[PDB]
Amino acid sequence: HHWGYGKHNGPEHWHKDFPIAKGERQSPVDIDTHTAKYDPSLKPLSVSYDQATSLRILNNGHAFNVEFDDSQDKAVLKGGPLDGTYRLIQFHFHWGSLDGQGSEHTVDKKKYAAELHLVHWNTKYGDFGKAVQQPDGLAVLGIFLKVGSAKPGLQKVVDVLDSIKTKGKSADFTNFDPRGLLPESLDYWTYPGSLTTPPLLECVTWIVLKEPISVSSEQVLKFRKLNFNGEGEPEELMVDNWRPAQPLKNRQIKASFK
Ligand SMILES: [C]C1=[C][C]=C([B]([O])([O])[O])[C]=[C]1
Ligand SMILES: [Zn+2]
Numbered sequence: 001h002h003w004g005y006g007k008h009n010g011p012e013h014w015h016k017d018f019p020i021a022k023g024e025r026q027s028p029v030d031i032d033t034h035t036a037k038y039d040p041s042l043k044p045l046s047v048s049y050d051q052a053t054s055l056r057i058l059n060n061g062h063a064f065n066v067e068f069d070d071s072q073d074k075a076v077l078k079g080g081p082l083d084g085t086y087r088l089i090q091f092h093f094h095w096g097s098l099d100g101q102g103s104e105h106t107v108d109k110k111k112y113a114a115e116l117h118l119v120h121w122n123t124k125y126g127d128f129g130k131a132v133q134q135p136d137g138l139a140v141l142g143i144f145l146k147v148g149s150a151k152p153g154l155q156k157v158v159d160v161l162d163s164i165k166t167k168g169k170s171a172d173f174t175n176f177d178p179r180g181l182l183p184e185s186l187d188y189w190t191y192p193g194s195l196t197t198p199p200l201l202e203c204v205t206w207i208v209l210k211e212p213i214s215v216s217s218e219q220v221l222k223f224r225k226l227n228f229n230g231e232g233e234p235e236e237l238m239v240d241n242w243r244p245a246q247p248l249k250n251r252q253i254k255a256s257f258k
Helices: 152-164 217-223
Strands: 045-048 054-059 064-068 076-079 086-095 114-122 138-147 170-172 188-193 204-209 213-215
Touching: 054 152, 064 152, 076 114, 086 138, 086 217, 138 217, 152 170, 152 217
Parallel strands: 138 204, 138 213
Antiparallel strands: 045 076, 054 064, 054 170, 064 086, 076 086, 086 114, 114 138, 188 204
């Protein structure tokens, strides 16, 4: 498959190879804050990242992934809408060419400058590959980024990007603390959806935090210097690697708050 974000291979084309792109539970969506309802059945959300063990950072030609050792019981997400325990495997971002766009989810149609996705798989299914054959296989914690003050906890990611400029490059990336990317509040919206890139599998419980984190203009500018292309190929800046909002269909978005 040769999908991407361009005019000739972008989101409007994905359905030809991945017909699930026009499915009943696709992501992202617009979160209409007035239609989302507080759900008192939601349990407290638990983000337990104290033993998170990052290993590596990879430019995969679509974004960059910070990968974790998920071989033991170590950085997990539980509670909220979730039954059981979901283990962190990687995080990545989606971002824009301009500060006015870049997020995948929108909030009352507002687009943020970027969106962080912390990807977790349901341990009852044993591995990520089996989890993505299940309707409750994955949980993704989504966090909006706005441009303002720098995020100190992001700077180690920013600083390593020079070593993974092009598709297929990786670098050791140990001892990174993903707690440094979390906002003060865990208030969230939740709904059932999908991966936002091919293969677009409908296996995700989305947990989208209401409070954005702030990053500096210089931090996001460094993201925009990455390349979609491989080394020695014509330069295509890695920008606008976001899928737009998809039809909500027969879903309800629930709020954890108020
Ligand atoms: C394999 C994979 C994992 C997560 C995502 B995303 O964008 O939905 O977080 C897309 C694809
Ligand atoms: Zn993502």
